[PDB]
Subunit: 247 residues, 4 copies
């Protein structure tokens, strides 16, 4: 690939990629960082295996992407209220979309994982949008969705940095399409979900100790796999803030 | 009701009505005819019980509504190729919509019917449209459907005489929504059909000898009931022509 | 028809019928009553037009069918707590199926109705069962449904008097199929409901003053039509009790 | 793991695994082979990376599993009519199920692959069955499916070697459930397919040169990913025969 400061091993031909040849415990210069971010924007989700960093180093790193909020809930490691831990989102979703302004991204970090199982699967909502017929794109271009646990977001959002359109709806937080009856709203959204969760649009992340991963919370969805029952899974994550999604 | 030359007994509060106090075998004057037609346009389907007319009288009558085509197929009574007889449309549909210009209306006439069973059920596609949320109306306003057995018609049509919008799609003749993929097209149309065939939008016509009925082939659908197996059902019908449906 | 003491005018070829030639204000002898009941069992729903009876006469009449319970809720005419009045069941259903022992039947009586609209539609759940393939009948023969507002009933019930099998489920009161997951339960029941609410299985009752109607609450469903907004509709009904439904 | 002659790196906690520490170009002894096969039966799909074998060696290897048929169609490398090549099954399916006796297994072998993309995804039909409620298992235990391009197979099959029950239906070859109407058959199968193609039941195989993979054609399904457009993908495969599937 066209990348001189980082090695870059794409996971599928649709999203996801792996990054090596960089010590995350050290500071990185503009041209190394310009590459890391240029990658994250093209692949949508990126991971860095065998990065034995510290929580302070975890924060700084996240901050490079954008301001570092705590999510209220979750339990932050006491000492680091920006760094929160993980040990129901086995339905595909993206995170905290009931917020006027949900997270741009999240950076996740493997502490103690199982040998196998406890994968995380992601999918591309650029792709989901992108595979709708021009006629269907037009038909729902201007619709809005009500997300809750309360707010409204557009059904198709433009990425603030990259300007690609991405379909934006998820079954965990989306009540209905504003202005439609429920029979109507249900009808569409179900189609749109059965369409986005196709296997062609997905990828699967294998979890290995001190791997550090970043996903774009606007233009992907993701889901936990429950195939580890019995085995300890302990990861941490910081949350980076984004503007209000828009069309 | 507000009707001085014809008695008028509405079947439901959504469509359909019954008309008496008029000898169909005689000619009718402007103000009697102005009423018959003013009714047909409000009720969408009308019937006239115990009208022992002749096929010539059947034609003239139809012609009052508009030019009288034969449908190729069907079998016309030999002697009257405009008058065709009846003895698969047990799915709801409207007639011959695969035509660049389908029938405006049809006039049907009971020769030998059963005592009961062999009803005909109709429904209102004004109502179907009318009960869609303003937001959903807008969402599909500008879509087109491909009808076959080949042509395109709009998904929402304006009535040429009355100017009411009416949803216009049917599962017997409609392949798909132009420009959409089949998974997409299927999704909508199924909703739209499951929505239009609601019981609230329907009515049911009881068939009795020398009853003469007229239905509006643009803004209704209709379906045969198969509950007469064993009993003779013989009706005739002329077909009145309409312009190309439009939005 | 084969009926010497009552005139009997079947509404469709699937269910429903009309009964005249009997003064309901008078007592009726075994052979007249033997006919009324022999009809109710074949047609599933029966009506008697222009019966200007009294509430006491309404009770006695109902009692001929079976014991006369009050439903708690509903509002009984004060003076007659067995006689309850009517002025959400616009979804098809049958009545009070959340009871260990729901009503066998109900007798309804028209006080002040509109000229048209405010029909009541019924359907046959004998027919619904009856049109399932032998293979599908077998597949769900032994299933149970959980009904609530709490109890279990079989999915296919045998009529206590007639011994015809009837499909027995309804979307207003049925939570799920016992033992199945919700994705599973949903799947079937939706099919079974989309199948039973077909138009071929239905009929529609026209409501006229002092008409008195009886429906079989085990083997039909029924639904109110909302096409009278603005017009006064006042009917009364007594409720006749039935055993626990069984297979 | 409990394996002394082969190294064994499970792909997910549901199916699939990777096998190293064995030169496939050499013969292997009972206890090494007893392990390879004991693995294939537990993981359902297995792969061997960086095995630069020959087509004769490819055949012998396959034969160890069972007799080696050609599939008519496909194009066999001229010189080896048992060894067939690959360069519509982007719907999930299993192979040639329209046969009275479909393939037990297939062995596939990577010649020239892309750097990334052109993955193959598999899923477990043990798991699919296994996650149905006991009540639903019972409900469809005894059903049959008609497969075509013509034959009948059971909807739930017992594995001839292992004796685990596995759900057995696929949307590419299955017409309908025998004895049911199409509305009925459609209803179930759609549920069963929407249920089996869940992400939790899947895995994804990364393709790398001279990797040799074996999948169990009775108890998995699999699907091609179209994310390589432009890049050369050339694999070969032999096909191993199985008895008629049974319950
Ligand atoms: O726990 C994981 O694997 C990530 C899944 C998730 O739902 C989240 O926190 O966004
Ligand atoms: O035969 C009838 O009852 C009318 C039904 C019909 O499909 C038609 O000719 O349009
Ligand atoms: O009010 C009616 O028309 C009868 C409908 C109904 O839901 C009932 O009381 O069972
Ligand atoms: O070509 C592949 O990736 C295997 C997919 C397939 O459909 C097959 O041959 O069974
Ligand atoms: Co390098
Ligand atoms: Co340093
Ligand atoms: Co690596
Ligand atoms: Co420290
Ligand atoms: Co900050
Ligand atoms: Co869940
Ligand atoms: Co707010
Ligand atoms: Co609501
Ligand atoms: Co689907
Ligand atoms: Co889904
Ligand atoms: Co008059
Ligand atoms: Co004259
Ligand atoms: Co009359
Ligand atoms: Co003559
Ligand atoms: Co003419
Ligand atoms: Co049909
Ligand atoms: Co043309
Ligand atoms: Co096509
Ligand atoms: Co529906
Ligand atoms: Co429906
Ligand atoms: Co329908
Ligand atoms: Co008499
Ligand atoms: Co007296
Ligand atoms: Co009468
Ligand atoms: Co009194
Ligand atoms: Co009593
Ligand atoms: Co309702
Ligand atoms: Co109880
Ligand atoms: Co539950
Ligand atoms: Co349907
Ligand atoms: Co329905
Ligand atoms: Co070893
Ligand atoms: Co050697
Ligand atoms: Co390896
Ligand atoms: Co050689
Ligand atoms: Co052989
Ligand atoms: Co395809
Ligand atoms: Co055969
Ligand atoms: Co067929
Ligand atoms: Co689904
Ligand atoms: Co799915
Ligand atoms: Co699917």
């Amino acid at each position: 690939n066209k990348y001189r400061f980082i090695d870059v091993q794409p996971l599928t031909g649709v999203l996801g990629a792996e990054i090596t040849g960089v010590d995350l415990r050290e500071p990185l210069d503009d041209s190394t960082w310009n590459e890391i971010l240029d990658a994250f924007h093209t692949y949508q989700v990126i991971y860095f295996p065998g990065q034995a960093i510290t929580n302070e180093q975890h924060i700084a790193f996240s901050r490079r992407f954008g301001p570092v909020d705590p999510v209220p809930i979750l339990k932050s490691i006491e000492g680091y209220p920006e760094v929160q831990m993980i040990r129901i989102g086995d339905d595909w979703h993206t995170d905290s979309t009931f917020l006027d302004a949900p997270p741009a991204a999240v950076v996740m970090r493997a502490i103690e994982v199982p040998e196998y199982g406890g994968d995380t699967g992601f999918l591309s909502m650029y792709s989901a949008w992108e595979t709708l017929s021009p006629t269907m794109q037009a038909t729902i271009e201007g619709l809005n969705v009500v997300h809750s646990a309360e707010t409204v977001h557009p059904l198709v959002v433009t990425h603030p940095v990259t300007g690609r359109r991405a379909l934006y709806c998820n079954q965990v937080y989306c009540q209905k399409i504003q202005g439609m009856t429920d029979a109507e709203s249900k009808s569409l959204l179900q189609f749109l979900y059965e369409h986005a969760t196709k296997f062609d649009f997905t990828c699967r992340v294998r979890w290995k100790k001190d791997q550090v991963l970043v996903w774009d919370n606007l233009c992907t969805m993701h889901r936990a796999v429950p195939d580890y029952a019995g085995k300890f899974r302990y990861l941490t994550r910081t949350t980076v803030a984004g503007d209000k999604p828009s069309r």
